[PDB]
Amino acid sequence: QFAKPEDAVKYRQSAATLMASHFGRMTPVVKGQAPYDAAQIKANVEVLKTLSALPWAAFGPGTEGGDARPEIWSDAASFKQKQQAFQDNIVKLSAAADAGDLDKLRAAFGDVGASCKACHDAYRK
Amino acid sequence: QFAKPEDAVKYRQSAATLMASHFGRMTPVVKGQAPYDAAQIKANVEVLKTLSALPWAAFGPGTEGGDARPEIWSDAASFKQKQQAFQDNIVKLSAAADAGDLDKLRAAFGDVGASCKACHDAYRK
Numbered sequence: 155q156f157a158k159p160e161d162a163v164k165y166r167q168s169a170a171t172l173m174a175s176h177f178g179r180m181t182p183v184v185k186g187q188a189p190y191d192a193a194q195i196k197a198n199v200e201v202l203k204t205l206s207a208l209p210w211a212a213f214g215p216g217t218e219g220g221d222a223r224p225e226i227w228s229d230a231a232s233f234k235q236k237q238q239a240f241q242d243n244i245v246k247l248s249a250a251a252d253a254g255d256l257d258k259l260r261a262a263f264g265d266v267g268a269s270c271k272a273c274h275d276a277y278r279k
Numbered sequence: 280q281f282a283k284p285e286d287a288v289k290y291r292q293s294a295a296t297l298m299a300s301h302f303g304r305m306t307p308v309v310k311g312q313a314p315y316d317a318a319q320i321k322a323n324v325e326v327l328k329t330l331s332a333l334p335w336a337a338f339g340p341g342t343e344g345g346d347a348r349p350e351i352w353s354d355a356a357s358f359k360q361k362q363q364a365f366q367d368n369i370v371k372l373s374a375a376a377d378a379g380d381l382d383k384l385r386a387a388f389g390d391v392g393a394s395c396k397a398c399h400d401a402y403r404k
């Protein structure tokens with residue numbers, strides 16, 4: 155859906171920006187510094203769910219640029235593993251949110267964050 | 280969820296960027312230049328659905344900046360009307376997509392686009 159590689163870059167960056175906001179805004183809740191409203195969190199994680207699936211299609215062939223390391227393309231299977239592991243941890247966060255359990259939510263949140271960071275450490279400049 | 284007004288700006292711009300991609304990528308389909316796969320479109324409009332609800336919460340009090348006209352805040356009821364009309368036209372596009380009918384889709388797509396543009400004409404610098 156991208157006319158030029160730069161359009162794919164702008165898309166994936168914008169998707170990541172929204173991901174960071176919908177993930178990060180729960181930090182005060184998982185830490186207890188903000189109240190836990192199970193319905194609020196369930197709704198937010200559904201938004202994060204949808205957003206979390208979007209960046210990967212914007213790393214197609216020929217879309218090298220931005221802060222994406224070239225290894226994303228030459229090591230496609232390893233990058234796909236990182237993305238699917240991340241999306242699997244998103245499924246677990248959704249389950250914790252849907253269950254309404256703050257303990258489970260704080261564990262699942264941590265697992266998601268570690269997945270974000272493991273991918274950045276390997277594949278983000 | 281925004282530490283500083285600039286964070287709200289960056290959010291709403293990124294949400295708009297994704298909206299433009301998930302709306303605009305259907306142009307070749309509504310024009311007939313690309314094939315119409317009803318399931319593909321139904322899935323894409325569900326993504327657009329979710330995205331379409333996101334910008335408005337990032338125009339809260341004190342988040343003046345970017346290319347947002349100050350009138351968004353001093354004419355809050357008119358801006359809310361523009362956003363709700365837009366979201367209502369998104370509901371109609373969802374119904375056309377869910378029904379699998381290209382004629383309906385091309386009419387609803389046009390209505391959505393006009394709603395985007397009417398808001399920009401009034402409230403985007």
Ligand code: HEC
Pocket residue numbers: 163166167168170171173174175177219220221222223233236237238240266267269270271273274277278
């Ligand atoms: C690989 C499987 C990744 C996972 C999982 C996550 N991110 Fe990521 N992110 C990745 C890349 C390769 C890039 C660079 C994209 C480019 O072309 O520049 C990014 C970028 C970001 C950014 C910065 C975006 C910007 O405005 O430029 C953020 C804020 C970001 N990513 C956040 C983020 C979060 C919160 C994640 C888990 C919830 C996450 N990313 C996962 C690759 C991958």
Ligand code: HEC
Pocket residue numbers: 288291292293295296298299300302344345346347348358361362363365391392394395396398399402403
């Ligand atoms: C008001 C009710 C709006 C509707 C409906 C739509 N948009 Fe919009 N958009 C609006 C404002 C006030 C702004 C400026 C935000 C800022 O602070 O700068 C925007 C911006 C955009 C942009 C540019 C984003 C960027 O990268 O800076 C785009 C591409 C955009 N909007 C697209 C868009 C589409 C495709 C819409 C309907 C599907 C749509 N917008 C609706 C306000 C409003």
Ligand SMILES: O=C1O[C@H]([C@@H](O)CO)C(O)=C1O
Pocket residue numbers: 174175177178267268270271274
């Ligand atoms: O909110 C965020 O979480 C991840 C990472 O910091 C988690 O360790 C990331 O890259 C964000 O923007």
Ligand SMILES: O=C1O[C@H]([C@@H](O)CO)C(O)=C1O
Pocket residue numbers: 299300302303392393395396399
């Ligand atoms: O794809 C888009 O559609 C609207 C407008 O051009 C429709 O008239 C907009 O602002 C986009 O980025």
